[PDB]
Amino acid sequence: AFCNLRRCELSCRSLGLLGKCIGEECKCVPYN
C-alpha cells in the first residue's frame, strides 16, 4: 500500500510542518 502524501503535505502544512511519507503512513516534521 502507498502513502497519502498529497493529503499529508497539506494537513501538516496547516500545522506548520513538513508532510513526510514513512512508507504507507504520514508524519508531520521540521522542514529540511
Swiss-Prot record:
Tissues where this protein is expressed: Expressed by the venom gland.
Gene Ontology MF term list: ion channel inhibitor activity; potassium channel regulator activity; toxin activity
Protein's name in the database: Potassium channel toxin alpha-KTx 5.4
Other observations noted: Negative results: does not show inhibition on KCa3.1/KCNN4 at concentrations up to 50 nM.
Start and end residues of each stretch annotated as [R/K]XCQ motif: 6-9
Localization: Secreted
GO cellular component, one term: extracellular region
The keyword Disulfide bond belongs to this UniProt entry's keyword annotation: yes
Similarity annotation: Belongs to the short scorpion toxin superfamily. Potassium channel inhibitor family. Alpha-KTx 05 subfamily.
Function according to Swiss-Prot or TrEMBL: Blocks small conductance calcium-activated potassium channels. Shows activity on KCa2.2/KCNN2 (IC(50)=0.0243 nM), KCa2.3/KCNN3 (IC(50)=1.7 nM), and KCa2.1/KCNN1 (IC(50)=42 nM). Induces cell death when tested on human T lymphoblastic leukemia Jurkat E6.1 and human breast cancer MDA-MB-231 cell lines which constituvely express KCa2.2/KCNN2, but not on human peripheral blood lymphocytes (which do not express KCa2.2/KCNN2).
Positions carrying Tyrosine amide: Y31
Phenotype for R6A: Small decrease in cytotoxicity towards Jurkat cells. In r-R6A-R7A; 1.74-fold decrease in cytotoxicity towards Jurkat cells
Primary localization: secreted
Keywords in alphabetical order: Amidation, Calcium-activated potassium channel impairing toxin, Disulfide bond, Ion channel impairing toxin, Neurotoxin, Potassium channel impairing toxin, Secreted, Toxin
Species this chain originates from: Hottentotta tamulus
Disulfide partners: C3-C21, C8-C26, C12-C28
Swiss-Prot/TrEMBL domain comment: Has the structural arrangement of an alpha-helix connected to a beta-sheet by disulfide bonds (CSalpha/beta).
